[PDB]
Design a protein around this ligand. Structure first.
Ligand SMILES: Cc1ccc2sc3nncn3c2c1
Ligand SMILES: [Zn+2]
Lengths: 47, 162
């Protein structure tokens, strides 16, 4: 696993083309996330 | 492992706010649905609360460290994570085995505000070969799992990117 950029705890990937896209985030320490909810689902076929 | 899964009732305000964040963050993907399938919404089958004393104290311990390095600001988000290894994550927690070495921002653990983005990774990088049973990245039958995770960002490096 790589290191955060010096002086940073994470990386934000900000969308700079696709106007509808929300952000993605990267952490470099497993201890910086807690898996609070397990969601079981199916994707639905559009009508 | 120490992990117990508590079923939330569909009547529970917690089930309802988690379902709304799942449904409201679906978007169209530039791959036209290649990795994650073609869909506008989900059928939510179950929401379970993940309870592990040891993994929670490991989280709050690191969260206090980050906040003390960032003017008492953890910069905590709720974000989606998709992985074939959710069973290992809920029992043993996140670690370097859940990193992506070839990710656009290097070997780290990736999270998304878009549930539909995390959906592209449930069956592997770019959807892998799709569901175990039908080898179908757009399977409407097989049950998928996502995590909705508490994530400490602290001071985040801003990358402008396509
Ligand atoms: C490699 C990669 C890049 C972006 C994302 S956003 C997300 N949500 N769950 C997994 N991921 C990933 C994985
Ligand atoms: Zn299937």
């Amino acid at each position: 696993m790589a290191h955060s950029p010096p002086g940073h705890h994470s990386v934000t990937g900000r969308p700079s083309v696709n106007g509808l896209a929300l952000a993605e985030y990267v952490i470099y320490r497993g201890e910086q996330a807690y898996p609070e909810y397990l969601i079981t689902y199916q994707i639905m076929r559009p009508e | 492992s120490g992990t117990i899964l508590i079923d939330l009732s569909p009547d529970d305000k917690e089930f309802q706010s988690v379902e709304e964040e799942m449904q409201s963050t679906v978007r169209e993907h530039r791959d036209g649905g290649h990795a994650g399938g073609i869909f506008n919404r989900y059928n939510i089958l179950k929401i379970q609360k993940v309870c592990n004393k040891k993994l929670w104290e490991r989280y709050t311990h690191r969260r206090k460290e980050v906040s003390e390095e960032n003017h008492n600001h953890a910069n905590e988000r709720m974000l989606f994570h998709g992985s074939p290894f959710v069973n290992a994550i809920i029992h043993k927690g996140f670690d370097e085995r859940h990193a992506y070495i070839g990710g656009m921002f290097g070997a780290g653990i990736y999270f998304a505000e878009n549930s539909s983005k995390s959906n592209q990774y449930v069956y592997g990088i770019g959807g892998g070969t799709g569901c175990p049973v039908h080898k179908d990245r757009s399977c409407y039958i097989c049950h998928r799992q996502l995590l909705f995770c508490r994530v400490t960002l602290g001071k985040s490096f801003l990358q402008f990117s396509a």
